[PDB]
Subunit: 337 residues, 4 copies
Amino acid sequence: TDQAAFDTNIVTLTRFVMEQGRKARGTGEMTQLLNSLCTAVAAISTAVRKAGIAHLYGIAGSTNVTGDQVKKLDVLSNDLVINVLKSSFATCVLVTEEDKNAIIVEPEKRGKYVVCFDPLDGSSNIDCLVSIGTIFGIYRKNSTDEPSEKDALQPGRNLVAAGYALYGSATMLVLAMVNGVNCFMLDPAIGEFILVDRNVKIKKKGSIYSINEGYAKEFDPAITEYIQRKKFPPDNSAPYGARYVGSMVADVHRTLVYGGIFMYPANKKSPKGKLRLLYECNPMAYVMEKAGGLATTGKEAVLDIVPTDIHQRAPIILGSPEDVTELLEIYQKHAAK
Amino acid sequence: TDQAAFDTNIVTLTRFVMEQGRKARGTGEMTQLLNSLCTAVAAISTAVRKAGIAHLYGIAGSTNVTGDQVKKLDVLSNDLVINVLKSSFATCVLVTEEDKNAIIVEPEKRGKYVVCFDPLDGSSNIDCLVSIGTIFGIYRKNSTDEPSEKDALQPGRNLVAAGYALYGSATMLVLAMVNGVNCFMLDPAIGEFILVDRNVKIKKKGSIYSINEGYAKEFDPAITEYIQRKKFPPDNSAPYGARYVGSMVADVHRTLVYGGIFMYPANKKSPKGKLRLLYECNPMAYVMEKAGGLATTGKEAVLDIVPTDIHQRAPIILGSPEDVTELLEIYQKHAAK
Amino acid sequence: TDQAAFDTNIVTLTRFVMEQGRKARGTGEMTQLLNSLCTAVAAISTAVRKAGIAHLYGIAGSTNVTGDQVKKLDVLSNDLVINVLKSSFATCVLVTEEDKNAIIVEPEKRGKYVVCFDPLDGSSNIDCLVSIGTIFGIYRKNSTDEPSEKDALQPGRNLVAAGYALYGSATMLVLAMVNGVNCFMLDPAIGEFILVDRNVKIKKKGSIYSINEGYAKEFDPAITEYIQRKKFPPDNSAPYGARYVGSMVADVHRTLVYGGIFMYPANKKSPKGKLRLLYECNPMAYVMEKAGGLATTGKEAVLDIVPTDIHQRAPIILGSPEDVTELLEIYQKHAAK
Amino acid sequence: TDQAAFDTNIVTLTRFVMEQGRKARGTGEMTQLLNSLCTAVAAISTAVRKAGIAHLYGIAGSTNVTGDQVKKLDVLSNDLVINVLKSSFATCVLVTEEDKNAIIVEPEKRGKYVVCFDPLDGSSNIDCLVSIGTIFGIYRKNSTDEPSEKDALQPGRNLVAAGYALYGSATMLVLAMVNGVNCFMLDPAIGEFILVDRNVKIKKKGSIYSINEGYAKEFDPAITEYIQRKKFPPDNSAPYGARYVGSMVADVHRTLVYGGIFMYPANKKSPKGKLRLLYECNPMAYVMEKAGGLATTGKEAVLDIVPTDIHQRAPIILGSPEDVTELLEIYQKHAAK
Ligand SMILES: Nc1ncnc2c1ncn2[C@@H]1O[C@H](COP(=O)(O)O)[C@@H](O)[C@H]1O
Ligand SMILES: Nc1ncnc2c1ncn2[C@@H]1O[C@H](COP(=O)(O)O)[C@@H](O)[C@H]1O
Ligand SMILES: Nc1ncnc2c1ncn2[C@@H]1O[C@H](COP(=O)(O)O)[C@@H](O)[C@H]1O
Ligand SMILES: Nc1ncnc2c1ncn2[C@@H]1O[C@H](COP(=O)(O)O)[C@@H](O)[C@H]1O
Ligand SMILES: O=P(O)(O)OC[C@H]1O[C@](O)(CO)[C@@H](O)[C@@H]1O
Ligand SMILES: O=P(O)(O)OC[C@H]1O[C@](O)(CO)[C@@H](O)[C@@H]1O
Ligand SMILES: O=P(O)(O)OC[C@H]1O[C@](O)(CO)[C@@H](O)[C@@H]1O
Ligand SMILES: O=P(O)(O)OC[C@H]1O[C@](O)(CO)[C@@H](O)[C@@H]1O
Ligand SMILES: [Mn+2]
Ligand SMILES: [Mn+2]
Ligand SMILES: [Mn+2]
Ligand SMILES: [Mn+2]
């Protein structure tokens, strides 16, 4: 904005979420929900860096603790999130990756908000200590009937706020809402998320493609062509550098920052893709969009899809708009009846 | 062994290292080195976790800017290492990537070990919260003359200890020395590395190849032919998964743990590979060979190469043994003249 | 309250402050202020445990850091609080122990709240590592004229919320408002204050008197008598155990928990007492009251005093109601013209 | 000394201890002991900071209650110490306050040093966030027979190392051994004790007496007469300040640093003082004498007392030297028959 004097400002998530809600002039039911997520993320971060790992390994004498088939990070995560969220008194339906059925919040603690989440993502690949994260999407209950599992089933286009928490070399909470995508970072010493990036928009074109090339054998022709074009470029420019961490949060996030494109196409084994719609694809699609990028299934678009199963998968391609445009055309070229 | 069922107790790094040096009646000058290097790691992890960022963003009101010097991470890291090193009174020649020349420790702090390190690998891939690390290789001075750069130029086969710390969703330290490879997890809550994996041995055969396929264009046939046999197996068996975090510590680490192979061979833009020998190549190689795998370059083994220059580069291929011998064969099948 | 089923609840300060404000049906200007204090307390706690002390002492090479006459805990504290508070956009006047004049917040950031505070209390006695704390009192600007220093000058009875943060063996934030006194405790691992005590009320009678007996020579007769009665009890019961930490927050807090009584009478040197009215006595008096205890100057009562100097001192006696009643009578007995 | 202006660099405990043992060619069995004991402290500090309380209050949803065993602090502490101790392979007889008998380390872990500790002094004064601590005194086994309780019964004069860790607004470790007393500050951020005060020597004469005047009734004349000379000095000089935190580590610590004296003499309810000799009295005494002060009991010196029982008690008077010799005189002036 235009002019003044001395302004040294430190925006903390809680402050932001607070201000933002007041402008919205909303009651604060959400703002509660938003803070409850904030706390889940920080406690999960602590679990993820294996704080207290010493007790499990005999510092306290190896009491009753043992690392193998006992306290797993997933369950704990799902426990926290569901707990910390019900007590927010703002949710009426929790749809989680780890929980088969849609959780319907007991009336005493009901709220007008549906929350779809993946407590710990890439959690398998924690043994290799690779970057995992938490993804979430929030919808507002637009029904009138008792909060049925159905209330989750809404196009991503209906999201009221979405985002993910990356537990990489440092912990980042990316939040996206109507007006923008903002990245807040955790300062562990004081347990606070500081706005380190405001109104994040993604590069028009990038120089990285992210895909598990090992499925080459089963990739569709349109994809095969796109990739070859990145490796061996026609006009003889620089080829695209490749990346594949193997963790959705890590790839989407790097795509959001350096640009480039991510893809997890349909292949026979998962002809509907591996990634889920409600709590993986959608929240990420939503962020890409608010950032100025594109999330497409290759033929249609992620957010316009209308779910029929809370656990339904979907292909997903998202990244810089210009790259994703390039791949969408190649799909057109090959598209037929 | 006499009587001890399924047992296991707390074992810190410090204690671990300590008894190891007792076992082989060392003067205790090296213990002081592993001791020091470790303190360095522990602290760097913390700088890497952007812990304390709050103050840096005005929460403390950057008066006229503040801090006890916390700038470019790789620069402060570089400092921190060289610092707790000289003060170990166990080093004579320190070689850093971030340093054009070799460092020759003044006579006061002058020890006897030559130490090579890459203070922060992935230093640029940092903005993405994508795992970074620290690599160090230790050499025993072998000469009579004044320590200098030449004392650093010894083939990897002459290493005495070698490891790397990986800053990811957890901070892990891997330490290999004559007996084997031992992984210590940093329990941040109490600031101590705990022994979680002792005597690590690698998978004879994994299901993952790792490489920047962005360079497929500049790939020598053997490589190019190998990648193919993984994507589309000749014997119509399940194809290899692919994973490229784009950070050596993370990929070398994933390959150590989960099995598989890692490739960073020569190309049109880098005839001798991109990876530096003394501080990236030999350490990973040493760990690898001590873990049970191989570390070839295509035709010769990493550890035998005799260094003509401290900042020398080299192509590298390391991983499971059955896997690295397959690519070697392919490399033999395509004999060069 | 009466009946239900399964209720496992974790109340975090932020949540509490949030809920409480909604019931109040207030806009949220305060709630902002309340959270801004919450963050100051946590950052100061970090400074108090000397986190990063290593950098000042050469880990980073003793860069430009030196411990003596450089970065002091007081100033830093006062810097944070004033900073973090102005940016709350909820304060128009800050009266601090460490700042001679009443700070008048620049219009861009003005709010309808006056905040009186002692950034670091007992800060002198930190060398002996003894318990220090932060005290604060909040008044609502009841004037109409430009926020003049005068706006601070209001009887403690006019406080809208008050409390203190103890940085003892563990960090506690005690908050008091119209409806009650609640103690929240910091879990450093996740940077969150959990309600560990709800609606704290103090014991009618105690068994500890807290006073610097070294001033015996100059104590008034009424005090001299009270003390002798604790030491040598008339009715031959158990004498009172004595305590004197030398830090107001530590004594007031232990008085609030185990009961007993605190005193810091007038003596010739400080015939008006040592403790200040606006940001030491008043906030503590206010807490004692809401807890069911009493804060008296010996003749009148702390909260009814009407200030004329923002830095004016005042005697103060506070603790269990029955003990403080006992001492008030003894003052009556001796009181005259 | 040769050339070094006003200089100072980072010095960790570990490094410090390490070189100390090198200097006096120890087998390194004791280094392993100071090493171990320290890890214990570091961890206890953390349990004492109630860090992790969140989960304990349902944030993680105490499923059917959880934890890696974190109960009564003094009980877990007691455990932790005895644990990292046996596993040091440096202890034969461990004596704990919380333990009715002496612990005799099994032959496998059986070392040679006898270790006496009070795992958590102030354990009850904890609810008030009032500083607590840990005290330990080390004895070298002197016998040929089977280690047992008698090996613990040696006068304080035969101690080899002694110290205490104080958990207050900071975690400090004080270590005294033949050469002197050295204070190490715990920098929690990186989990390492840093040398802040080397070779501490106490004030010949302080301005603070310390004692539970609640017991004035049961005070022996010399004491009673001494307290008077401080409150109302005969030579009409400034009176002594008084401070009684009601926790030995905090008061012994304040007295070490700021000067002054500390008294816990006999009385009607405790003819032999309340403080236990082996784990509270001798350590503080040793530190005191090594700091430059005295530690008398009234007529004989603490360190010479020969223990008839491990849980023996003793009155104690320690502090500045000129101060402790004044009370002694007074104690001589009131000769007992
Ligand atoms: N913290 C916030 N950030 C952005 N929008 C908000 C926020 N709080 C409330 N709103 C908007 O106003 C609506 C109503 O708020 P509520 O009464 O709390 O449910 C929310 O669904 C949002 O669309
Ligand atoms: N802590 C240790 N772990 C493994 N080998 C060690 C250790 N300490 C000493 N040694 C071996 O013994 C030699 C003598 O160590 P030093 O005298 O301490 O420099 C070293 O070069 C190592 O090869
Ligand atoms: N967090 C809160 N706790 C208690 N009372 C509050 C809170 N927030 C607002 N109130 C009450 O309502 C008044 C108006 O709130 P406000 O608009 O935010 O200034 C405040 O002065 C309080 O008296
Ligand atoms: N780290 C040390 N600091 C002070 N004295 C030590 C140290 N290590 C060994 N010593 C002395 O030397 C003796 C032999 O030590 P040790 O063989 O390790 O049990 C001990 O009893 C101590 O008196
Ligand atoms: O490409 P792969 O080998 O099938 O696995 C990748 C995907 O696994 C997941 O866990 C599926 O949800 C994602 O985090 C990730 O992007
Ligand atoms: O993007 P590229 O060109 O494939 O190289 C990535 C490489 O950079 C490095 O960080 C160099 O130190 C390697 O560890 C890493 O694998
Ligand atoms: O009793 P003394 O020796 O005067 O000092 C005590 C007082 O000092 C102070 O710093 C004065 O504000 C208080 O914290 C404390 O209660
Ligand atoms: O309240 P009292 O009776 O004066 O005793 C307090 C004493 O308790 C102890 O904690 C006993 O271990 C002492 O360290 C401390 O000074
Ligand atoms: Mn997932
Ligand atoms: Mn590198
Ligand atoms: Mn004060
Ligand atoms: Mn005790």
